Design a protein around this motif. Structure first.
Motif: not given
Length: 689
Positions: A39, A45, A49-50, A53-54, A68, A101, A104-105, A108, A129
């Motif tokens: 990655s 920002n 990430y919210k 896309d999840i 992903h 980051e 973060k993956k 989510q 978060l």
């Protein structure tokens, strides 16, 4: 047309890089490789990430949607969801480049797929978060070159519940670069939390702490020679730090209670004693001239200022029969004097940090329910100056384990999975386990083995230690100098050392007091005998799950921090994540040719591509070759035999194709030379649209 990354139009080295750029330049962040994740970092920002896309990455496979999720986790991390087992993940790719980051993956993807309902579930999904700005203060610290260059060995463990959602966690740290507080290279700085406190409070409160409006007056701050910086705002950060503490669970009432502990250390810190004319000739011992400073150390302790120095500066020992009687002692030399000075002022912080992060969890941790545990890794980044020093060696040593880690996992553990899945496997040559850098520093007659050998020869300086390496080696691969290797680049007081793919020349400055740092129990006993939640507080309820045997001359003590790391790696199912920093300008669309190519090289990733498979051009997975080229030949229907070899032979024989051109192993087709690919693809076009 072509999904995934292992179906490139041209599987050449050049196309690999050219396409990598085009990927990042076409709304494609992550990249695959025989189940390996790579990655990048936007450094800002990014609205991706919210929720939105999840929902995309939920109830689908790898060969369907953009990079992903990588199915491997779905067929491993989930494989142990029903089989009820533990997990652990490792991340790397420079410092301050989101490991914030890359982690973060993990979350989510975990959530949503996990569960919902609980109003306390979506709320905790917000605080974690909001921990990014939080973690950007503790671990991170500005270096001479990189600003967000954290410096620590952290292994965070995420605890869960009986339904499949987080509940809490604990934090573990290795041997700390504890010299960061008092010593460092000119221009650099220590942790931010400190400097942001001195210029955020009021003189009225500073007096209560015992601080005076005069930075040069101190020593620890004087050694640096820098305080006020135009870039970072001091008064503006403090109020933000308070919010972070209050938001988590640290009210002002608790803050003040903690500041007393920190303020106490500052008093015991600001004391670099002067020359003590006690001896006769040229040598000397230690004695206080700046009394008010050492008095401040005992001020918070409220004990006889003199008696305090009777047990510390002077080493008392008796023992025998019962157990010890403190009073008669030894005025040690300056070297051992400044040694204990550091060992003391530095050990207290290691105990503090551990007790700081742990006692915070006491409030955050969930008592409502229990569950399993999953680990996450995060460490400093790769930095190289035109010059070098001791600290560079230890940091590079940590990388030697990280590289060995993958070798032990993605090259060894995964290789054992080949025979566990019941696949016709044949041992293919893999680059040696580089034990030349391992056996050379474990069993008798080794680097760290001879390092401890020279360090214990108290009189022996760092310069003499260098000569102790050359004689023992200068023949075993991966070690050179100016004497043997005729290279002017090497100084007369420096040495050469090879790692992965390059050369690094280190300096000798430090080493001694930088390494040992050990602290005995003859200096702690007198202090923990007091009666004050601050004094004895510095030493939590005896042995926080880390003791067994307390008094051991350094060397070994460092081995523990590194051995405790390995022992818990050869008994778990790990997961791997890599990261590559774009550029040194936080630009989400700029390439520094020389810098990027180097990052991809010293990590050895493209070699892990060819060698792992075997080493050639065009390659395709059987598991993915089967469920793809089904509607081409006959006898490849549910009436199949089972074997992936005999079946393929039945396929290629009916259309006249040599058998030696293709070979069977784990899950990768092997047809040598490029031309054959263009030959296969085309042949599938001039006779079937």
């Amino acid at each position: 047309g072509v999904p995934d990354f292992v179906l490139l139009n041209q599987i050449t080295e050049n196309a690999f890089i050219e396409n990598l750029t085009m990927r990042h330049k076409s709304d494609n962040i992550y990249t695959y490789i025989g189940d390996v994740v790579i990655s990048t970092n936007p450094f800002k920002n990014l609205n991706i990430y919210k929720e939105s896309d999840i929902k995309a990455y939920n109830g689908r496979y790898k060969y369907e949607m953009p990079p992903h999720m990588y199915a491997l986790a779905n067929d491993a991390y989930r494989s142990m969801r029903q089989s009820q087992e533990n997990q652990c993940v490792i991340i790397s790719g420079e410092s301050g480049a989101g490991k914030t980051e890359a982690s973060k993956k993990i979350m989510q993807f975990l959530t949503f797929v996990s569960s919902n309902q609980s109003p306390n579930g979506e709320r905790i999904s917000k605080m974690l978060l909001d921990s990014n700005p939080l973690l950007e203060a503790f671990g991170n610290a500005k270096t001479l070159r990189n600003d967000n260059s954290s410096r620590f060995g952290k292994y965070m463990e995420m605890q869960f519940n009986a339904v499949g959602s987080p509940i809490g966690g604990k934090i573990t740290n290795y041997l700390l670069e504890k010299s960061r507080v008092v010593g460092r290279t000119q221009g650099e700085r220590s942790f931010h939390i400190f400097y942001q406190m001195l210029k955020g409070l009021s003189q009225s409160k500073l007096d209560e702490l015992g601080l005076t409006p005069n930075a040069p007056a101190y020593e620890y701050l004087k050694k640096s020679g820098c305080f006020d910086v135009s870039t970072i705002d001091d008064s503006g950060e403090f109020k933000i730090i308070v919010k972070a503490m209050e938001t988590l669970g640290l009210k002002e009432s608790d803050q003040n209670s903690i500041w007393r502990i920190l303020a106490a250390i500052l008093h015991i810190g600001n004391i670099t004693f002067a020359e003590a004319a006690e001896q006769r000739t040229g040598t000397t011992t230690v004695k206080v001239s700046d009394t008010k400073s050492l008095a401040a150390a005992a001020s918070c302790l409220k004990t006889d200022q003199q008696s305090l120095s009777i047990a510390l500066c002077y080493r008392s020992i008796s023992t025998g029969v019962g157990k010890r009687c403190e009073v008669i002692s030894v005025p040690m030399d300056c070297n051992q004097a400044a040694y204990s000075r550091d060992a003391l002022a530095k050990a207290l912080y290691e105990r503090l940090f551990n007790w700081l992060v742990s006692k915070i969890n006491t409030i955050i941790n969930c008592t409502t329910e229990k569950g399993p545990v999953i680990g996450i890794l995060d460490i400093y980044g790769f930095e190289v100056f035109q010059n070098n020093s001791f600290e560079q060696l230890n940091i590079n040593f940590c990388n030697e384990k990280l590289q060995q880690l993958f070798i032990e996992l993605t090259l060894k553990s995964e290789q054992e999975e080949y025979v566990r899945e019941g696949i016709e496997w044949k041992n293919i040559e893999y680059f040696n386990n580089k034990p030349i850098c391992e056996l050379i520093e474990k069993k008798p007659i080794g680097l760290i083995s001879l390092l401890d050998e020279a360090c214990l020869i108290a009189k022996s300086t760092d310069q003499t230690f260098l000569d102790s390496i050359c004689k023992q080696f200068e023949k075993n691969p991966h070690l050179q100098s100016y004497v043997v290797s005729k290279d002017r680049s090497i100084g007369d007081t420096c040495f050469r050392l090879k790692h992965y793919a390059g050369d690094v020349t280190y300096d000798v400055r430090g080493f001694l007091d930088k390494n040992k740092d050990t602290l005995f129990g003859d200096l702690i006993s007198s202090m923990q005998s007091s009666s004050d939640p601050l004094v004895q507080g510095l030493f939590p309820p005896t042995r926080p799950e880390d003791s067994k045997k307390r008094p051991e001359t350094a060397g070994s003590q460092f081995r523990n921090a590194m051995n405790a790391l390995i022992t818990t790696l050869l008994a778990c199912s790990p997961h791997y994540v890599r990261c590559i920093k774009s550029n040194d300008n936080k630009q989400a669309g700029v390439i520094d040719e020389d810098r990027v190519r180097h990052q991809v090289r010293y990590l050895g990733l493209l070699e892990n591509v060819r060698v792992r498979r075997a080493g050639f051009a065009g390659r395709i997975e059987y598991t993915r070759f089967y469920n793809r080229y089904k509607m081409l030949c006959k006898k490849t229907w549910p009436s199949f035999n089972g074997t992936a070899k005999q079946a393929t032979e039945l396929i290629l024989q009916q259309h006249n194709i040599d058998k030696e051109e293709i070979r069977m192993g784990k899950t990768k087709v092997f047809i040598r030379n490029p031309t054959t690919l263009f030959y296969f693809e085309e042949k599938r076009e001039l006779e079937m649209p």
